[PDB]
Write an enzyme that holds these catalytic residues in place. Sequence first.
Site, PDB file in Angstrom:
ATOM      1  CG  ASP A 152      -1.625   1.286   1.484  1.00 19.98           C
ATOM      2  OD1 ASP A 152      -1.581   2.172   0.619  1.00 19.98           O
ATOM      3  OD2 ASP A 152      -2.285   1.405   2.532  1.00 19.98           O
ATOM      4  CE  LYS A 172      -1.562   7.300  -3.359  1.00 12.83           C
ATOM      5  NZ  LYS A 172      -1.979   6.312  -2.304  1.00 12.83           N
ATOM      6  CD  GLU A 216      -4.858   3.978  -2.463  1.00 13.67           C
ATOM      7  OE1 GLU A 216      -5.668   4.802  -1.988  1.00 13.67           O
ATOM      8  OE2 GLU A 216      -3.747   4.304  -2.930  1.00 13.67           O
ATOM      9  CG  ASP A 236      -9.030   5.074   2.543  1.00 10.21           C
ATOM     10  OD1 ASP A 236      -8.528   5.412   3.631  1.00 10.21           O
ATOM     11  OD2 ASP A 236      -8.396   4.482   1.643  1.00 10.21           O
TER      12      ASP A 236
HETATM   13 MG   LIG Z   1      -4.211   5.260   2.306  1.00  8.78          MG
END
Ligand SMILES: [Mg+2]
Length: 387
Positions: free
Chosen positions: A9, A70, A174, A198
Amino acid sequence: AKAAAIGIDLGTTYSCVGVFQHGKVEIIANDQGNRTTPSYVAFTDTERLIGDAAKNQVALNPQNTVFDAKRLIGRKFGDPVVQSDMKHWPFQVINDGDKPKVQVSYKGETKAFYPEEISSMVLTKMKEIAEAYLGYPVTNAVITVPAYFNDSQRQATKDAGVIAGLNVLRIINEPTAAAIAYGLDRTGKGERNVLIFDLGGGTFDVSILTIDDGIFEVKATAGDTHLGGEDFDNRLVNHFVEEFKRKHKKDISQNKRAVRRLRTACERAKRTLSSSTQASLEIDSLFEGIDFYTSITRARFEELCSDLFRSTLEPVEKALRDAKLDKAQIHDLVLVGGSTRIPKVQKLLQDFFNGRDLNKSINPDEAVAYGAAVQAAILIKSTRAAA
Ligand SMILES: [Mg+2]
Ligand SMILES: Nc1ncnc2c1ncn2[C@@H]1O[C@H](CO)[C@@H](O)[C@H]1O
């Protein structure tokens, strides 16, 4: 004889690595005992630091400690999002052919790196964490990305894996990885609608997926790229700065050390408040030699962040509208991200879904890596069919 493959991840703020062997997943701790590793890289005259060692020295080396790569990966320098984010980072972001690069001082030179090069350093550390556990070199891996990532962002993430010496088996979404961790794709025939909530350190994502015979379809994505745990830490810091002003008639805001020490204590009190109805905060000589020993209740913390927690329901409503589904049509509600440990956040989501129970039986910080590790083990299978 076949080496295990890993699931990674690759997070905005933290990363996590898992391996699935013998019907079980192991989320691998790093050498400092942490099951998650900061997505940070620091450069000095003599070392390149990755993970905890980088995050732990950020206070005095902010210009040469990179994080949030990211947010840049696969984007153009001219992108409005990139120009806005740059205003909040202490490190330099430069323009090379309308592509962003981070620029730092490293081993006696000025050096510029593409975001995929910074992410390849984070991936190198995650590969080494897994090799320390397995006891042999690792080469195969599944890496996850947000469901809204485009082809350029997915390709840049594959390139980061390649630079790290990894063979990237697949780039998976994800929320798909989180559903796989719960085995939601193994429910057999019939459509299943899954909502992934999330909430992490710096971002908030809501995804709706439909799964049928193990086949995934992303039906909707919504969220806020700038909402997360750090915003709750910020609210606590402001509250304490005000409290100090009230008690000692001093504003501690300009001393960076005081604000950093307060912020660090705030984040830990915040974690306590997910388990206890009160949390004490004790700091020796916070400002001008004054000890700051106080407490905060869960009710006070909830009041301080109330609007932020409530705002998480707007993307849930939007995602349901976009997926063309009513609340009752969602089979599974899944919690991902460290901030979903906050009781008030769970309550708000449960109340929104008229009392429905939430899937949180898998550690929220580790669900994405867990799913990626299950998918990696599936992908390296090479058995020839029996007659
Ligand atoms: Mg995350
Ligand atoms: N028990 C917890 N309660 C609240 N927030 C948490 C908890 N554990 C981790 N977090 C937060 O999750 C985010 C990702 O680690 C961070 O903002 C961190 O502070």
